[PDB]
Write an enzyme that holds these catalytic residues in place. Structure first.
Site, PDB file in Angstrom:
ATOM      1  N   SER A 110      38.413  34.476  40.985  1.00  0.00           N
ATOM      2  CA  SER A 110      39.566  33.611  41.040  1.00  0.00           C
ATOM      3  C   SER A 110      39.210  32.159  41.330  1.00  0.00           C
ATOM      4  CB  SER A 110      40.591  34.125  42.072  1.00  0.00           C
ATOM      5  OG  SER A 110      41.323  35.201  41.517  1.00  0.00           O
ATOM      6  N   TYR A 113      38.763  29.478  38.691  1.00  0.00           N
ATOM      7  CA  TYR A 113      39.908  28.766  38.072  1.00  0.00           C
ATOM      8  C   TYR A 113      40.491  27.630  38.888  1.00  0.00           C
ATOM      9  CZ  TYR A 113      39.613  32.662  34.952  1.00  0.00           C
ATOM     10  OH  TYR A 113      39.181  33.591  34.058  1.00  0.00           O
ATOM     11  N   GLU A 146      39.561  42.410  36.538  1.00  0.00           N
ATOM     12  CA  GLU A 146      40.774  41.671  36.323  1.00  0.00           C
ATOM     13  C   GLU A 146      41.913  42.665  36.435  1.00  0.00           C
ATOM     14  OE1 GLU A 146      40.515  38.972  32.917  1.00  0.00           O
ATOM     15  OE2 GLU A 146      38.374  38.558  33.413  1.00  0.00           O
TER      16      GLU A 146
END
Ligand code: 1VA
Length: 353
Positions: free
Chosen positions: A243, A246, A335
């Site tokens: 994560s 991003y 994911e």
């Protein structure tokens, strides 16, 4: 002349509210997406303009799948609608699936910047009242989202910290500065829906700073044109380091500042995959979530639980270990996907440096 009332917010919250509505941050974000901010200033961004950009991309997508307009020509129409800056060289043609999704992802980011602009519009009541809140209290209130800053001995603090440290990068793990509990009400009623659905997990969702206000205001959303390796849903990770990939991170003084959410996700019955499927729009029948399984997973033997609104929510606490069953997966890290907005409830926001 109107009175400006004193700010009710603690220092950390004032900084957050400053950061997530900052015109600098927004223009920075645009420049980093190659947009021409001089031809597309913040106050000039419109819903109509963005809508026309998605129409231009849909025309490109159709041509990419008969005597129609060439890719060059349909690209040039897109760039007239959404001005790009490439040092006044021509901008490049949108002629691959990967480039098309990238432009769709830019426009989704741009739509949330516009949302934050629209949100800030001065209402008529605000023009007639004789006292106004401090600007940061006003911007906070616009979110219609309660944020409570946590200190060191809040019951979940060490659990969150441990999740961050054990699943973040081994060499330059993001440093925790603050945690806020997030209560966005009217996420509450839709999320109660899935009350009987067990298998809840607290999961990471990293984003860039330019969409944090929108998320705080409207929750995590599946937008038309959302996509990726597991299709058209909302993406989460069990490993903070996935994560964190991003989080763009804005330069402020001597450091980088960024923001990450923890969402309580009602995963229910999981469908596991080991190969990319960008065409998914729901789990298969009788499944509530799709997990694209990683070569690694936070060691499940160290999983703990938190109790949030009466329900047990799994929180990983272990370092990633190998999962031999998924050693040949196309995914290095898992994911986690849901395909209904109501299966996620935001719970925490972290500031990391
Ligand atoms: O910033 C994001 C969230 C991206 C994200 N993707 C994940 C994918 C797999 C696992 C975890 C994540 C994650 O934490 N965030 N989405 C944007 C719209 O809000 C669009 C976008 C998509 C890709 C790159 C940059 C922007």
């Amino acid at each position: 002349m109107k009175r400006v009332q004193p700010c009710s917010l603690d220092p950390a919250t004032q900084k957050l509210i400053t950061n997530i509505f900052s015109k600098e941050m927004f223009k920075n974000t645009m420049a980093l997406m190659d947009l021409d901010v001089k031809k597309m200033p913040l106050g000039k961004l419109s819903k109509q303009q963005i809508a026309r950009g998605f129409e231009a991309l849909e025309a490109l997508e159709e041509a990419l799948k008969d005597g129609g307009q060439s890719l060059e020509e349909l690209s040039s129409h897109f760039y007239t609608v959404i001005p790009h800056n490439f040092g006044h060289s021509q901008p490049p043609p949108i002629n691959s699936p990967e480039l098309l999704q990238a432009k769709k992802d830019m426009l989704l980011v741009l739509a949330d910047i516009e949302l934050a602009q629209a949100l800030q519009a001065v209402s008529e009541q605000e023009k007639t009242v004789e006292e106004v809140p401090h600007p940061l209290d006003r911007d906070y209130q616009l979110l219609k989202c309660q944020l409570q800053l946590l200190d060191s001995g809040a019951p979940e603090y060490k659990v969150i910290q441990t999740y961050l440290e054990q699943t973040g990068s081994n060499h330059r793990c993001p440093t925790l500065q603050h945690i806020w509990k997030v209560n966005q009400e009217g996420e509450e009623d839709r999320f109660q829906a899935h009350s009987k659905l067990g298998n809840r997990k607290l999961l990471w969702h990293g984003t860039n700073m330019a969409v944090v206000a929108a998320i705080l205001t409207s929750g995590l959303r599946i937008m038309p044109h959302s996509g990726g390796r597991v299709g058209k849903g909302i993406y989460f990770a069990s490993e903070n380091s996935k994560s964190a990939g991003y989080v763009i991170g804005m330069k402020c003084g001597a450091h980088h500042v960024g923001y990450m959410f923890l969402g309580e996700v009602a995963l229910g019955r999981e469908h596991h995959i080991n190969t990319d499927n960008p065409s998914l729009k729901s789990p298969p029948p009788g499944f509530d979530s799709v997990i694209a399984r990683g070569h690694t997973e936070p060691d499940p033997t160290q999983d703990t639980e938190l109790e949030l609104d009466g329900q047990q929510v799994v929180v990983p606490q272990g370092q990633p270990v190998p999962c031999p069953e998924f050693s040949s997966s196309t995914f290095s890290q898992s994911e986690y996907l849901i395909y209904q907005e109501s299966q996620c409830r935001l719970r925490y926001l972290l500031e990391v440096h």
